[PDB]
Amino acid sequence: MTEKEKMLAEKWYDANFDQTLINERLRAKVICFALNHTNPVATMMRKVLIDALFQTTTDNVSISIPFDTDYGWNVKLGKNVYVNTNCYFMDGGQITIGDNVFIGPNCGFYTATHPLNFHHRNEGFEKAGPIHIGSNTWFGGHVAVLPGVTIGEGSVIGAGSVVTKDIPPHSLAVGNPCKVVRKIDNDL
Amino acid sequence: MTEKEKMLAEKWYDANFDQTLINERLRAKVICFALNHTNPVATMMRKVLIDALFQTTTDNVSISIPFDTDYGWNVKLGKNVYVNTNCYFMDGGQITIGDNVFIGPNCGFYTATHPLNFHHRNEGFEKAGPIHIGSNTWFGGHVAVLPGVTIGEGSVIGAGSVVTKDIPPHSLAVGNPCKVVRKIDNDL
Amino acid sequence: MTEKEKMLAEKWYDANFDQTLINERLRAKVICFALNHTNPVATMMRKVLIDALFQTTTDNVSISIPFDTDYGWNVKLGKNVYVNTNCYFMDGGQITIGDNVFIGPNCGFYTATHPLNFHHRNEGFEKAGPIHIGSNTWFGGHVAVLPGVTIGEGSVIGAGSVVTKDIPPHSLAVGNPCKVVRKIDNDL
Amino acid sequence: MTEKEKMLAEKWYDANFDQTLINERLRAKVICFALNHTNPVATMMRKVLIDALFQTTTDNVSISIPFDTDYGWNVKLGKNVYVNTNCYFMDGGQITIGDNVFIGPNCGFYTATHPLNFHHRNEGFEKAGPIHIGSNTWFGGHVAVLPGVTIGEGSVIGAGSVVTKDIPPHSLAVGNPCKVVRKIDNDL
Amino acid sequence: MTEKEKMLAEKWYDANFDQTLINERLRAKVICFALNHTNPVATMMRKVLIDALFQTTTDNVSISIPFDTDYGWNVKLGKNVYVNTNCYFMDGGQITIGDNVFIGPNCGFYTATHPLNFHHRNEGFEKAGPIHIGSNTWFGGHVAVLPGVTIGEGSVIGAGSVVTKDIPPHSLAVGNPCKVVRKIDNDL
Amino acid sequence: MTEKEKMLAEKWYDANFDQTLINERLRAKVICFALNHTNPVATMMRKVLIDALFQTTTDNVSISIPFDTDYGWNVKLGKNVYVNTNCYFMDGGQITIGDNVFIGPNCGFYTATHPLNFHHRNEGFEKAGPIHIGSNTWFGGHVAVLPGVTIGEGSVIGAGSVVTKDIPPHSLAVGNPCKVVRKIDNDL
Amino acid sequence: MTEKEKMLAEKWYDANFDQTLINERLRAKVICFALNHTNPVATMMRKVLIDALFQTTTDNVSISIPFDTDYGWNVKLGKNVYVNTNCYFMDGGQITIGDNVFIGPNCGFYTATHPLNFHHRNEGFEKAGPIHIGSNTWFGGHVAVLPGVTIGEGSVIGAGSVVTKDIPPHSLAVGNPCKVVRKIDND
Amino acid sequence: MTEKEKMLAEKWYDANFDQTLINERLRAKVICFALNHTNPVATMMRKVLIDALFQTTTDNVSISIPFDTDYGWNVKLGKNVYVNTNCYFMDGGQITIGDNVFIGPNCGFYTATHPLNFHHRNEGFEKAGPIHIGSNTWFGGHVAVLPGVTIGEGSVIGAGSVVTKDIPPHSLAVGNPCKVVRKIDNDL
Amino acid sequence: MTEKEKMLAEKWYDANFDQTLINERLRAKVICFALNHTNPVATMMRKVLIDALFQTTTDNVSISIPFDTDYGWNVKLGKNVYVNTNCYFMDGGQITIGDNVFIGPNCGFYTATHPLNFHHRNEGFEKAGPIHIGSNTWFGGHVAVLPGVTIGEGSVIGAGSVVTKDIPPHSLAVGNPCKVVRKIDNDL
Amino acid sequence: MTEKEKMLAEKWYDANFDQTLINERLRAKVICFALNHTNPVATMMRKVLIDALFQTTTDNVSISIPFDTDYGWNVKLGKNVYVNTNCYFMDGGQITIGDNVFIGPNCGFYTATHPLNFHHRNEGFEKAGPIHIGSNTWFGGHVAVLPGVTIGEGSVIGAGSVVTKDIPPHSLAVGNPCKVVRKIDNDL
Structure with missing residues (x-):
């Protein structure tokens, strides 16, 4: 197995020093740089860039720069995804986002786990923990989502939350660590 | 009432899909893009852009890019406002800032509330909650101020605070959620 | 003593209004602007800018823009320092970083303390509190490190932590405020 | 009263040497420079600039560059205002323009009066004379409108006219000085 | 008949709102923009642009920018036409210019007539009145030539004239309105 | 005598076809192009350009672009000369401007006379008529000053005037042709 | 007669050394250069350039760069003309294109004939042979159409064809030289 | 089925007028434009663009511009593919290229078939015919490969060939139409 | 012998992998890139680039871009060589072009021979076959000339020809493969 | 007397700290910067810049950049002056150059004398010593001409000379200090 194959299989891999992975990250950084330096008025160019970045034709995926x-290519998107300013989808582990998702500003979706032992960590080792963002969800600003976390559909994450554990569907959750406050009435 | 008139009247309105509001947001993004790509050395140009953005002649309002x-135009500023790097004034609801205000880096002043029910939220509805920042205040870095909140004059907000509720004047407040620690002696 | 000499001596000084300090900060912002607008593909140029910024020849110091x-010049670096996107080293007070340090995205290392009394704060006064980051450490994303704090070698700071007080060596610490959870086994 | 407050109150004020007024004029010139150097093809950008200039969301206000x-901000516009090439709205005194107004090329709307005595004039003094352009009007090319003038609704100003005095509604006026020729039948 | 066909046939047509005409005007504005932003030193480029604009190979047609x-394409030119700074050939109605014509700065040749009744004018209606400029003529600066006017060959138009009616050949004409002063001796 | 020497001696000369004169005009057109494309914020650059254009160190000569x-080099300026937008100093004949002169927008100072006979005019012949603008004068917008004219010190020229003949000192003059209305009281 | 007048009258003319013709070709090269260096995203700019090039308001004429x-101005176009990458309309002789025409990539429509004798050719002489492309036609990629050739309406030209002679209407033609294979039923 | 789904299933589809397909082609045209305007010296940037275009990390795929x-994304590549100047991979139908393939200049790989009947063709209909290029092949310059064609591994295609039908493995084939000349000895 | 010496001696050489040859090809691609991005109006710059490419002072060598x-440096030219759009001189083997040569658009002069056996070809080996283009020749558009071919002086090559074998002087030759049609009368 | 008037009168003046002189030097530095950054191909632009710099129409004055x-304006030139690369005409004191003068590369013509006493020198004082270069002279490369020096007509200055004293006409002079070797026969 290559280091990319180990990353995708959710095994420990050299994220920091594998040339292939460093080069695949470069491609995403180059496209993000072009997007981040495209005037907000250049609508068609932004759409082309976001599509080239995710390697898909997006259906109403709004991204506020940066x-x-x-x-x-490891970010799987639904239709109608609203991403505010300064979001980071750290996608070594697949980040699945449903339909009708509101992501506030300064949100981070982190899939990277480093070893706790400095000897293994200094070697460049990481384990990718995929994130599942259900459809019909709302994230406040300043939210950090940790590796392996699943946010159930219809759920609301309060501003400033650090989502360390899975959040069930149709739930209002807030805090550092993020804890469920109450269920949400999502009937028609 | 137009959707802009409903926004300003603190009523539910279509923030995401009203063409007028999408177009007024475009103007602010275009000016912010010009500001964010202006060399720090270009002092006169930064001043011109800051003044075009707020639609006012600022009096010692320092903004560190981005x-x-x-x-x-919905950000009302006093004199001597010091804004560090990466701040966001989400101003659908008026953001009133007094005189002599120190805003640390990575701070967000959020006035947008979305419905908890996904059916109403997916339709683009929002309610604007104005923020009042009193004169003579200090915000640490990584602070998020939530809709409808009032921070009394002479108050200090600790770094990493999530201000969910009103802070009284001359108070030291810290945490997620933000709670008053003690009063401040603000005598000459 | 000049205001720069008072800053370095850990005494109260006019940070906001001293021309020398305003001008030394301009130099760092001009170099940061050049770096932030350099395509990720321009490897040699990024190395030259990073080195001009820190006034040293760096040894494997990776910085993700912005x-x-x-x-x-008040950031003292070791070899192998990995800095993710949107980090801020507010270095009025010296920021010492050891070898083999992993800094996640959206992290702030703040050394500036303003007076609590608005009369002294409005005058531009500040006191610089140096930060010591030990070798072999790991910082999650969305972390804020406060003035005067020391993070012991071999320690791990969880994502979303607000480090208000010193963290001992070989410890796992998380939260707002940041508290030690358990010690780490850092043996070979 | 500041010199800006005197300008707006229709009192004598230092237009030429007041720093605030020189700086507010700079902002309009900077936006006009950006507009004048924007390709005619850049429709969205021209709209953004026109809106930033007038500090309002225009409704079908076409401006041919330069x-x-x-x-x-002292130009109050109605909907459907058609401004041909090389027009100048000298707006120290408010310029009110109604709905459905056709302004030909090389037209000047001048609100500045200087003293006749050179001693007072050389000191930088001016008096602002607001201009009222009624709805449903038509201006030929090469027209100059002088301070304090009112052009009644439904009126037509011939090419090369120098409008020194008020023009009544529904009138055809031509010449240097501009004099009424006949009334206009403005029935459906 | 299309609105372009009505314009050319000297019939009332929708000049302001017909897409074809709006688009044909855009082409001329794009070429004029390129010409107006071409350094005076770029002789060959200016010649190419002038020729692309008039859709003809010009023979000593000098144009001073802007x-x-x-x-x-509705400006018919002879050889040796000298056009000074800031001229406007409003050519909805054909503008025929002979050989050896001196056009001073700030001259406007206007072929557009709007209805006097605001109801018809607000609908976008116009009637094109062709202008005929005879060979061997001289126009002073600040001259406005009105729709349907013919200036006979060998004639001289004084500076600041508003040419409302036809000028006979070999005549000296001045004023607002433009009136013949005397005949000119144009013998060898 | 060269054609430049004849121009300066107020004799008939080939203005249109002499290579030296065509080339000296090119230099002025190149400097004006640079000035016209300099952002209003670039104060020092504008000052350098105006100084290079007039071949002198100007003392408070403000020029609004274009x-x-x-x-x-044939424009002789005093101190404190305020030139509004779109002015043209056609200086084949020396244009002398005193101290404390207010020139409104769209003003033309024309020193070129062409022969009335088309045979001599088509050959490129011109006679330069110097213009003398006295100190302490005020020009309204849309004013044209003809060759050989002298405007006495302390005089005021109304907007839209065509100055065909000399105007005495301390006089208010308006119209096409420009005629004295009354004297001005210019006492301290 | 000027050299431009001789070109248009289908007479021998100095194409290579006449200043007027060299200058008229420069104008087309300058507009083509602007078009070839315009980002595909800039739709309105591309439309303006194509219209300035052909000196007409085009109706759905798509051109893939370069x-x-x-x-x-000697290219007469119909509505709905789809021109793929790297096409060259060498238009000294008028090139008439009908409505609904699909032109594949790397196609050349050449109207210039040089003399066979090198003495006359070295002097810069050429004769323009107009090309008529009928409405409702399809050209495969890598096709070269030679001077004076008429391609009848409803016809299909196979990829790699060198069209030396007239192709009748509603015909499928392929090869170097281009020969009719069969008729097309377009009813 | 969408028009993209029909294209991929090898069924008749609207290639010319489906918005999704027009937009997916735009993305490829934008990346090709960036590649075609990248200096040959910019090796890493060219590699990033080629990889963004094919949506894969290429292994020694050399492409000579344009x-x-x-x-x-419908071009499937092997390692060591050498593409000379001016090649076009018209990939509506998948283009599969093996390892060690030499493609000469001015080659076209066309997968688009239009209907012979103009009624269906004018409607925008097309059928995608995938092309299979075997490993270890060599294409001379000026080659056109037609829809549905398979070129067997170890084969050589002569310059100027029009490949209308399948070519067997280890064969030398030339002409318009392309016909096998002789077999190739491809032993070690 | 080096690989360059082997190339010039008409021997098998590592064309694709020799570092020196790769670097000399880079120089030619950099000059071709600069020339292909030079506006047709820039006559002297084009001349300088053409002369730098061929390493010679050309005498009436017109090249239409690209x-x-x-x-x-391996293309030997005569005087009066007219090269139309999209021509490729693949000159590992010397290309000799005489005087008075007309080369139509989309012509390729190919001197590269690859081995037929894929084992040797995959190793990067090539053999250069010089091409000799006699003086006074004419090439139609879409012509491919193959390695080692001589086209006799006074010859004409029909459009779309694939020149596989030598063409005698004063001959009309057309087709794929190119064959002589008749001799040409080349008398005065 | 102003400091510029003292400079021109050959009296001691504040060269380093007078604002007028610092600003007149800026104008020359700006024109030299534009000239030094103009491509050698831009012949007409170089001529315009050289003419703007010397404030005269030059007659065959060739200047090799930088x-x-x-x-x-204090450099008085004759016709046919050939200036090689890297020359500096330090012209506080007038530099008079005759006709037909060959100036080699890296030559300095210095007219500035500073006081020997550091007290007066540190105050910014200088005395301008004009340089007279006779017609028909030749300067080798690396020559420095000192203040007040006169080089007689027909003279030759050897490479590396430091011209401290006047050189008589028709003389060959070399060395540091520059001394006459022999007279030159300059007869027809």
């Missing part, structure tokens, strides 16, 4: 991503 | 705002 | 610093 | 204005 | 025209 | 001149 | 033409 | 492709 | 060559 | 001068 935007950051590690690979781009 | 800066973000939704409308610009 | 990056911010106040002086640049 | 355009000049002193303040921009 | 220059404006509505269509460009 | 500005046009034929030679530049 | 594009080349000698004069541009 | 290069054209319709989708980019 | 142009391509491998080395440039 | 070129430096302090004022430009």
